[PDB]
What we know:
homodimer; 6-stranded mixed β-sheet; 2 domains; nucleotide-binding (chains A, B); 16 helices; glycerol metabolism (chains A, B); Nucleotidyltransferase, domain 5; alpha+beta; FGGY_C (chains A, B); 7-stranded mixed β-sheet; ATP binding (chains A, B); glycerol kinase activity (chains A, B)
Amino acid sequence: FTMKYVGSIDQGTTSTRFIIFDERQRPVSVHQVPHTQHTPHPGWLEHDPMEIFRSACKCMSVAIAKLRQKDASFRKIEAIGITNQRETTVAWDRVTKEPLCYAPVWNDLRTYDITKKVTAELGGGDSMFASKITGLPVSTYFAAFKMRWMLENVPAVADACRRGTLCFGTIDTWLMYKLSGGKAFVTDVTNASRTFLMDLRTRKWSPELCEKLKIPMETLPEIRSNSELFGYVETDECGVAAALNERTPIMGSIGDQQSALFGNMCFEKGEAKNTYGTGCFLLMNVGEEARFSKHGLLSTVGFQVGRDGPCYYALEGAIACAGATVEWMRRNMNLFSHITECEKLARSVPGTQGIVFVPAFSGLLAPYWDPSARGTIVGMTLKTTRAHVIRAALQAIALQLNDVVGSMKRDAGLNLSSLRVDGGLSKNGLLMEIQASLLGVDILVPSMHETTALGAALCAGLAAGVWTSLEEVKAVSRRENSWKTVSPSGSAMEREAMIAEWREALKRTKWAK
Amino acid sequence: FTMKYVGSIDQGTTSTRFIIFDERQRPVSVHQVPHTQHTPHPGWLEHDPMEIFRSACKCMSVAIAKLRQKDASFRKIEAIGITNQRETTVAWDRVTKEPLCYAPVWNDLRTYDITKKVTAELGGGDSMFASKITGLPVSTYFAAFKMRWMLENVPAVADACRRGTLCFGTIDTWLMYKLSGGKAFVTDVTNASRTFLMDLRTRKWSPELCEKLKIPMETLPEIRSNSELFGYVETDECGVAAALNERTPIMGSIGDQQSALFGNMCFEKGEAKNTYGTGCFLLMNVGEEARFSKHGLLSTVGFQVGRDGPCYYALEGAIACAGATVEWMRRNMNLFSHITECEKLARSVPGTQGIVFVPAFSGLLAPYWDPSARGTIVGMTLKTTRAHVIRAALQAIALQLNDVVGSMKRDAGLNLSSLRVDGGLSKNGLLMEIQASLLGVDILVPSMHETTALGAALCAGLAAGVWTSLEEVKAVSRRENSWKTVSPSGSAMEREAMIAEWREALKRTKWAK
């Protein structure tokens, strides 16, 4: 009898992928399509919403074609999962069914002047005033402020509002709308968590905060869990419905960082993942109990399988320059050429020998939120060489996650029991080693490296009975997909001396304005 | 009359050259010979005195032989000049006429203990206690401490003192002694002023300091001027008298850095020279009255042409890593490979865009003598590149020299008039312009870039009457040789900014121990 498949749309910052997982949790077909990174004015960033939706549909149809080739039996896909760059907001009209303008992106800074205007007028100048409600400080990153800016600065959006025809949505809702073809207007708990308009505990919109921020609650979508029938796939944009054979259901929608948490099986409290993409995203499952933080970190929804099934929360931290630093050292500074040289050179020296390199190129994030900090190096002598500098950069990434995990542990009320790690920089042994030493936990490195897209497809597959329970998933994961592990190896006095160097260097980072 | 020629012996830290100059100040024959760098223990540097004397003698005989070959109107050498690595102290015996040990070098550190002993016991911690007499602080460089060390660590030297056979002398004195066949025992004012045993204002050995430090005044030679008959060459050590052919008087003697000041025509008060070598030596001519330093500089003899003729005094500052920084960027960091790239990489960006690179790899000298200062970089972003970093390094060199010139100005009671330049890093056009822009004066670059050797030749030729005065010397320099000029280009607004960033950066350099 035939293998059952689940589909997963990984809609990333700079590209979109479709991945068909089988019931062994193996990606069996994949395609990718980049979309354009528009930068009008320095600090801005935009996406064409129609470019993305089309990318997604191209990805679906091409990947489906290739699977039919290597398995001619494959009749249809059981369900489809959506995961997305979060907070990126699209504005679209409900009868034209098309974007009013280009979508500003999570790390765009057009909403700066509004971020200031808001905090004073509403919060009484309190950054974390909403944080008992949302889980978030007022920052440029969150949808509401993109939503407001669009109402304040885009004529077609301004008009669309009064006409009573303005839909707003994070990338999940935008996808899920068009795929159904007008028929579905829904977000999920993890994406909603990042709007700055959701009550964190209750998992419902905040009439207070919508009203307070001037956002017609008519514009917002119907919140749901991550794992349940969202809609059907009813379009033929790039042969997609034809290619699908049946009307495949969309039974999975989840924020991309949470989707890595879920795809790395971080189901129980105290478990965490860190993605090493361009920057970092560390998320730790804090369990059924929601949590808040003195360190300026974020409180967010981790996951929720089904309606009224348990909602687990999480605390979230980041670093801005992780991969960016490795790449900067190569392309900007010419410290090496071939990617793998980075690890070899750092290895080739006993240690940093008294240099620290705080690679805070766009300020320190995390539990020392310094927008004035810059990229800085200290303690160099004529014996200092590129190798030391590359090593220091790697230690500094590990030192940030240490200070972040340190912060998380206190205000979560738990220890970190193990760290799963994903993204290109997880394939660097020395960094995983140093990380595992400093934190003092096993670090698991999944050889099925596509964990974000699995999180999406797992939700989908739970809600269609490809997998019956989380333990069947956990079990199959352990049965089919291999979990290489890196253990601590730390002289605890060295951790002291390394963090003391670190503490000291951070004082010399302050620079801008 | 017939064509006239003045020889100069250039006895450097790592080589010795004999350069034959013509009456138009062109170097018309040259020969170099290295001598062995002995390093017994880490931080110890020692030169074989007889080896050097053979280098000099062999240099003379080759250069002459080559000149007779390529110049039919070369008959003889009117006079010889001598210029030398300063502070480097030789102990020798009047009867054997050989060294009693190898001579410890200016940068040698074995005097360290003695030096910290002298500050504590003889000045109660005040290292400037003798600086009103000598113009100097207590440091490992100056000759008296190397004299002391040898007495107390070399039984041979202690022995010789007892009889009244021992002669201490700096390289000028040593070289003029053995060139005479031991018939001359003299030092010149510039060299003498690096002993820590000369009274600046009188320019005689101060008995107080000789006794205070317990170096007997009978081991020391006679202070004389830089330009006048010290003796004649009476030796055939490497066929030198055969080559010279006639009676050739030694009529010039001057420490290399002052020899540069003199060869760079820095005769008026307010006229500086900088040498851009491994590190830097900046010397301003301050005028006929000594000017003491309350801003970290050394007060020293500039020069004195003729015995009892006026003595022009000078201020002196140094920086450690000038050339060294350029090299470090190349060999340690991979920022460029061929020397010419350094400058073209720097030119390819319009400024440093807010980064500062303080290259105090072995601490800051100059007016802020901080040995805990270490190499640092601040202000980097993802826009920053090796181009910007190379440029910032070049800026750092001119920014220190600016702080040195500043400190000089305030001690000196006068303004910087011009800055002549030489060395090696002088060939980097961009560094000169940054320097001109910052100092707001014309930076003069001789094309005849052998200034150090020319100073000694000038001293000799004046004394012998090949030139009649300092104005003829300046005239003949202007007429017969080419000086390139670098005027300021830049704007007080930018100058102030570059200096504000710099001075903020210094606050962040403190690190070692």
